[PDB]
Amino acid sequence: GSHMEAVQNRIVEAAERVPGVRGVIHLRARYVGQDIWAAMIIGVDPENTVEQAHEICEAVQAAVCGKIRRIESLAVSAEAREI
Amino acid sequence: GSHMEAVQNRIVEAAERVPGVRGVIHLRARYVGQDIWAAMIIGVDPENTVEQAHEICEAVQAAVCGKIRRIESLAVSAEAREI
């Protein structure tokens, strides 16, 4: 089941190129029919505001849903990640 | 099924008395055996930091699990709420 490993990779790469994302902490993805439904946690600067972290999450969603073909549901939340 | 409405009320009141919580936005609660498992979204100042919002969520968890008897699982996340 490695068509899923390929896709997870592209999702991770896609997300990380959005401003403010410091790593994908967590990504769950499953096939629903021919579609992918995913849920993601991104690391963000602990000192970003809550409203900034929301904006980053939305940009990640737009970027991934925009770029990655079979993704039809993506939930994105944020956690503090110091690096 | 109104032993659940009573408990949801006490959870909401409990959470709202934690510093930085501006309303409970969402609370899902279910009985697992004789226990309650719940998941909650609190409103917080959009200008709090991410790390502050984490701390508020943890204080809500400590407060609710500490005070409300049959709750054995509580997940708490934060969303921006301007008021």
Curated annotation (Swiss-Prot), chains A, B:
It comes from Magnetospirillum gryphiswaldense (strain DSM 6361 / JCM 21280 / NBRC 15271 / MSR-1). Disruption phenotype: Single gene disruption has no growth defects, no accumulation of magnetite, forms empty intracellular magnetosome vesicles, decreased levels of MamB, mislocation of MamC in 1-3 foci or rarely in a shortened chain. Magnetosome vesicles are fewer and smaller, aligned in a chain with the filament, only a few have very small crystals. Other, possibly precursor magnetosome vesicles are visible. MamI mislocalized to cell inner membrane or in 1 to a few patches. Changing V50R: Loss of magnetic response, still stabilizes MamB, CTD dimerizes, binds cations, dimer interface is tighter and twisted. Fe cation 3 binds at E79. This is Magnetosome protein MamM. Fe cation 2 binds at H54. Belongs to the cation diffusion facilitator (CDF) transporter (TC 2.A.4) family. Changing E79A: Nearly wild-type magnetic response, fewer magnetite crystals of normal size and shape. Changing M40L: CTD behaves like wild-type. Changing V50W: Significantly reduced magnetic response, many fewer, much smaller magnetite crystals formed, still stabilizes MamB, CTD dimerizes, binds fewer cations. It is found in: Magnetosome membrane; Cell inner membrane. It comes from the Bacteria.
